[PDB]
Amino acid sequence: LTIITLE
Amino acid sequence: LTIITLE
Amino acid sequence: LTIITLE
Amino acid sequence: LTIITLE
Amino acid sequence: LTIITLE
Amino acid sequence: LTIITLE
């Protein structure tokens, strides 16, 4: 389970 | 399960 | 379980 | 899993 | 897992 | 797990 958010 | 969001 | 957030 | 962003 | 951002 | 940011 992997969650990545970029901004 | 992998979630990735880019902006 | 891995969560990463970049801004 | 590899994410790269250039600007 | 590798994340790289350049600006 | 490697994270690199340049500016």
Residues of C in contact with E5 (CB under 8 A): 6
Q: Give resolution, Å, one decimal.
A: 1.7
Query: By what technique were these coordinates determined?
Result: X-ray
Question: Tokens 């992998």 label which residue?
Answer: B2
Residue A5 near residue B5, CB atoms below 8 Å? yes
Instruction: For residue F1, count CB atoms less than 10 angstroms from its CB and return exposed for 0-12, middle for 13-18, buried for 19 or more.
Output: exposed
**Full strand arrangement of the beta sheet holding F2-6:** D2-6, E2-6, F2-6
The two counts, helices (H) then strands (E), for chain C are 0, 1
**Interchain proximity E5–F6, CB inside 8 Å:** yes
CA distance B6 to chain A (A): 5
Strand partners, A6: B6, C6
- How far apart are the C-alpha atoms of A2 and B4, rounded to whole Å? 8
Which chains does chain E touch, 3 or more C-beta pairs < 8 A? A, C, D, F
